[PDB]
């Protein structure tokens, strides 16, 4: 999926169940693979420490 435009998309659907997990990942912007390549992750790789809040927008 990382070689296609499908890596960015997140799948959801109608399932005969409740309480299921859409996704899950740790809060590691500098190290985690998910954020290692974002504008935030790319810039956080030239520095050693980081301190502040993070905004996640889901469309």
């Amino acid at each position: 999926k990382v070689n296609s435009m499908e890596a960015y998309q997140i799948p959801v659907r109608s399932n005969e169940g409740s309480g299921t997990q859409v996704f899950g990942f740790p809060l590691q912007p500098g190290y985690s693979s998910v954020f290692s390549r974002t504008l935030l992750g790319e810039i956080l790789n030239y520095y050693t420490h980081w301190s502040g809040s993070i905004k996640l927008t889901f469309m």
Binding site: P11, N15, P26, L27, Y46, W50, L56, T57
Partner: protein, 58 residues
């Protein structure tokens, strides 16, 4: 860099309620995530990025 002492936390998403669609409508959708920093975000100790690698000059 990954460090056990300074553990960040875990971000997860669950279904509060089931997705509901009418007839002649796809029941499979997708979501997009956008990550940015707040107005209280700072960094320190300028270091080189591991990503870029070079064995010879261009």
């Amino acid at each position: 860099t990954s460090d056990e002492y300074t553990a960040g936390g875990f971000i997860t998403c669950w279904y509060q309620t089931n997705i509901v669609v009418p007839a002649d409508a796809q029941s499979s959708c997708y979501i997009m995530c956008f990550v940015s920093a707040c107005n209280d975000f700072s960094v320190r100790l300028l270091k080189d990025t591991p990503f870029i690698s070079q064995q010879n000059f261009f």
